[PDB]
Amino acid sequence: YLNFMSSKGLGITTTYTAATSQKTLNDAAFVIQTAIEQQISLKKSTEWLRDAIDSFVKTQANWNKQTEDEAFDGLQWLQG
Amino acid sequence: LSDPITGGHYENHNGYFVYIDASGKQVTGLQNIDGNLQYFDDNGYQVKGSFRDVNGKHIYFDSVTGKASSNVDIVNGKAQGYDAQGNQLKKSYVADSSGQTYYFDGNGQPLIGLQTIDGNLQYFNQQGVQIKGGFQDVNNKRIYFAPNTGNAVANTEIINGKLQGRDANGNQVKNAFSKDVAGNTFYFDANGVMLTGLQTISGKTYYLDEQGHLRKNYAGTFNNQFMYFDADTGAGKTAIEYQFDQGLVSQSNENTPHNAAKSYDKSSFENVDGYLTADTWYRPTDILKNGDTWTASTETDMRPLLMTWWPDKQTQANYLNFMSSKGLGITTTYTAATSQKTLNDAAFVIQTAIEQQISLKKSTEWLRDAIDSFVKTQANWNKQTEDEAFDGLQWLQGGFLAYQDDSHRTPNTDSGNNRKLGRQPINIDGSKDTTDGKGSEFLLANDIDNSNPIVQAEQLNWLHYLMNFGSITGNNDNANFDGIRVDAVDNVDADLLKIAGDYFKALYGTDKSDANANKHLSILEDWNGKDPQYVNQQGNAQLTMDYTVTSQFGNSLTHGANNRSNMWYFLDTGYYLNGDLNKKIVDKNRPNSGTLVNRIANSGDTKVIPNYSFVRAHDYDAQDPIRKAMIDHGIIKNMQDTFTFDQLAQGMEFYYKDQENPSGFKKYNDYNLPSAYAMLLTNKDTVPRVYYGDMYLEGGQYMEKGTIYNPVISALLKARIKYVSGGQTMATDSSGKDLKDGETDLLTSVRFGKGIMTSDQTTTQDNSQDYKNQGIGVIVGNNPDLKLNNDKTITLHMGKAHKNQLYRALVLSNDSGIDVYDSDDKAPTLRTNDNGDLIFHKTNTFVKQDGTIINYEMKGSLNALISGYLGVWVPVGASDSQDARTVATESSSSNDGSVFHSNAALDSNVIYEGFSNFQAMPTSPEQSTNVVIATKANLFKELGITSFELAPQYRSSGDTNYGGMSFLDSFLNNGYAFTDRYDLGFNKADGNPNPTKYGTDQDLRNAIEALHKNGMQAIADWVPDQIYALPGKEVVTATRVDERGNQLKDTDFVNLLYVANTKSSGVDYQAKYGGEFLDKLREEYPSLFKQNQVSTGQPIDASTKIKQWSAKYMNGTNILHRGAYYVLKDWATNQYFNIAKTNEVFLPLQLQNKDAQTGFISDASGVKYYSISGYQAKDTFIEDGNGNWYYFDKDGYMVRSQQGENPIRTVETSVNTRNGNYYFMPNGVELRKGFGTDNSGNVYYFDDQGKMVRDKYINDDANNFYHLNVDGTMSR
Amino acid sequence: KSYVADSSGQTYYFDGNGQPLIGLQTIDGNLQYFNQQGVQIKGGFQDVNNKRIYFAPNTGNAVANTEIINGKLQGRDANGNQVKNAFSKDVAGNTFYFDANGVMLTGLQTISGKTYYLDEQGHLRKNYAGTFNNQFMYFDADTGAGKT
């Protein structure tokens, strides 16, 4: 999440890993939260954020078809 | 990346590699060390098999080497590729640590599922991994993906029990041919099932074997009627139609009488010994000047034979295409299949064009070059038909030809039934001719036939000329060589040793006394391990080398940074029974092994074989390293490569840098040279030899700069004079390969003094006192990381003749170098105990005799001068003029018949091999080797050199190269490669100076005299094996052979005519001095000329003198890259063209203005063939323009199979190499590289060239294996 | 300056001159060998100079490999030198270790202060857990080095 939001101009672009300390990630989440509220004031809208979250969510394997075992044999050929 | 560093060792701590700088500091971070990119964490340990982050880069390092390379990392949830520099890869394949392959797209994300890349179909699993070597159900189809590429291809699998076929798109195959991965083709019917046996499809017939494999290039009787299956598609032809496309046609026309030769002789034909060559030019009757008007030809007018005649249509077509390409006509694609008439017409339009460019340029040199070029294009006229090979001594120059005795075709070249090859010492009588014990007679250049008595006499003449060089060339009896080195002993007839030995006996009475023998020190380059025993049985006329000790230096000290044989191996304990050093019973029977001279307890009581020994030589541990260095730095590509002197100089700078590297690691150079010399120079029963290049740098100018080893070796040399004498012992702190807990494997070598032969001997038998201040102690290790246990003590048993005596160091190693002590006062002392032992501990406190206390650890060290330990100790109180040598006795000591004897007198000598093959050319006359030797003779006297081995002084053949590979001896002018054997630096005949690399002939005589003024002898390098770059051509009969003169197994180059360069100028010094001294010698010492030689049964023959070399006196030559058929031949009759004598002329009929008919013509009896030159083919193989081969029998008729009869025929031809069993089809075509069935159903196989194959396994491009019995049949 | 594969799958490389390259050659930094007819050797050993070299099945690129000399497996590196005192691979992907005398090692081996487990076939085992020292030991997925 931190890396994705960073890439969209919201902070220093970061390579964070699961190995990064919890404290660091939480601090970084807050600097992103700050930046978020600023672009909410600037745009007076949250639709830009809706789209950012939607996109980010589908990035993650637990939240997309990668954890759905897409297959195409038999009638599964039609829709996966 | 990161800037490179060198000069730091790698260290291992707790299972981890650390790297310590030249600075001496432990290294962290990313580092390029010697071209390898590596990383070390904060603690200084090296990372392997893990990813690290430096700057913007994600770099993996290898699991073995720790070197930066590509990998895939799972980063967060997802796979991402990375290169060697740590960049995320885009649109690239990467293989990970497990050898799995991903393809990452434009965004760097791996592709999944079916994909097409570079037009290749590939599949990827859901994790992004590439499927390779398997089937895969994707997109409602099954597809096989290839083992390594992973590309979609046809394949077969077995469904139920029936083979099924799958194509590239994953569809099953029905009604079609389809392959499998191995390469086999099958056919599958409408119901999908594979077909077997004979099948007709689409109006063509194919043969599928039991396995369903489509058989191509396969002959057999399938309809009980013959059928040949195509090499292209496997389609059956009846092989009834003749495939030759050339009917009998006449070639003569209106131009024939114009282009015919003016004359049938040497006037009108450029030739060698009467024969013609591809680049022969001839004189046509008339000339189409300017392409307009035929005009009679003047003598100067000459035209290339290839303008008008060709050996065959292939060559004709190639000539036309080549000349066309150079602006001479319509550029053409002609083949051998093109009609003869067309090619001939086209040759004439080219002839026209040629005469036009001759008028335009007013020259023919442009044409000379065009023909030369074209000729080398053709395989028959270049090395492709010479079977270039590089194994064995062939490594040097690419392979050898042996000349043959052939009075009918090549009589000037006949050797009179000489040319006995490989008569090396162990095979002097030919008794090992059929084994590897036959000598490698062929080494380099033109190998001289030293089995010929006439040649043997000439070699003696040359020998005499050298031994009297000064008397003969300067009337200076003090400028004569005293002794000889015999170059390449195992590559010549061993008679030469007897000839040389007997000569010395006759003229100097070397068999009379040790003083006579030793006044003419002489050595052998005799590498075979059985040569020492031979040389001794023959009375040691020249000193054998002792490779056994040179070899052990390689294994235990000189070679390799680490895993080295123990010093234990120097002892050769096997010498004694049961390896027992307490009991010391000599083992009278051993399995032909061990060192030549035992030195465990050498008291001089057992007779031993006299010898010289060395650590290095001009030709040992020099030529290879120096070139490896140039190769490693991109200065040349191959060892055989030609290099320039500047190229050598650049390489030499790296060589020197590596040699003197303070790290102590050496990549090209030898380790532990000081330690090796310390042993060499203290050993009893040997004449040691010292290599110039260990004392001075091997390149640049002579004696330009001393080496780092010079001080130490110089000290050892001067100490040898003062202290080295008496008996020897040698021991190691070691019992074998493997070391017990306390054991150091440190070698202790001791000499006792003049009359002292044993440890326990307390005094001389003659009561002389010389011994007390003589003797020496040497300690040496091969382990730079050697640390002693605190308790451990190491002892030098200096002997009971040296009780309670004070000893002082000559030489001591340490971590920065080796200290050298020039006199007693400047050195640490230490005193022997009551028993005469110097005891050493891990830690030592020595005292100087007057000055002070010194601390010293018995510690292995590592630096440019050593990798191990070295300590040498001498008795204090030695006189300044002390000399421990023994003078040689004038008395007849021995009735054994022998010349040299290993004893204290012989051991008092030292040879200096005073040159390097890689010296630069003298920049000025003043710096020429032999000038310098004269000014510096003094310096060598004081190192105890008694004989100076000078380089071979013969004039270098240089850059001259008549064909074939040049050798470094020649282009480096080192004197081993020479044109004139008697020119040792004489002036040009116009008066101008003409030095060798070493200086003029005067410089040589001055150098030799200077050495005699300083009591040293001068050694001549006697080089009888070969001679280089002879300017005259002759036609020999030659066979392609390996170093031992054995015909290569699969060669057609057998008894073929060849143009060789074998003839000397006849106006050279060899002409002046050749055989001149023999008459004088026969008069004065008759028995030399009456004594029989062993190999020949004959005495040497001075009745004929050699002023000019020629082929009849040679065994052969290195291949000259000219071709098997550069000497022109008619394919039809197999006779070679010739014009020497008008009674026996043979030319193509065109050139004699007769009608040449050429082609295939049928008659009632069978098919006949006429060559381009117009002769009928008989008893010869012939190739048509489409590439088919035929055999024409003695009667002149093509061989062909009849119905119901065996197609296999046994052929015995004029050309023997082609003898064998062939398979001819009904239309006469020979089967090649495929199987043929006989009339009875038996299958055989026939090779590349049509021959039947027997008694072996045979593999197939599709991995099918077949076996052929002895009778030829296939069991399979 | 291009590779071409012919009808039979044989591969040649043509230089600037157009003449097919013959003998040992380096291309795109890859070491390759060509017979006297200009054909590329793939999937086999070869003797060039003084060093025997294996060339890969598809690329033909020089790589480490093992062959059986007499009855003992031996190891050959990418430069064609036999391997002594080191780890070396074979084409299949297995790593072996060869001692000072060139002979492949077997079983539990400690080298350079680390412990590796080689099975009966001499294969270095990575990501392998077991207790054969009468003590537990996990052999690294990276290098096969034993950790506790």
Ligand SMILES: OC[C@H]1O[C@H](OC[C@H]2O[C@H](O)[C@H](O)[C@@H](O)[C@@H]2O)[C@H](O)[C@@H](O)[C@@H]1O
């Ligand atoms: O461009 C060459 C090659 O690249 C990839 O294959 C690399 C590598 O894969 C395995 O290690 C094989 O055993 C080797 O022979 C290969 O060189 C691609 O997968 C392949 O399609 C491509 O040809």
Ligand SMILES: OC[C@H]1O[C@H](OC[C@H]2O[C@H](O)[C@H](O)[C@@H](O)[C@@H]2O)[C@H](O)[C@@H](O)[C@@H]1O
């Ligand atoms: O070469 C003289 C040498 O011969 C025997 O040893 C042969 C050979 O044995 C090993 O394999 C060592 O690794 C080599 O260094 C040896 O040269 C004798 O036993 C030995 O004493 C002698 O020096």
Ligand SMILES: [Ca+2]
């Ligand atoms: Ca010879």
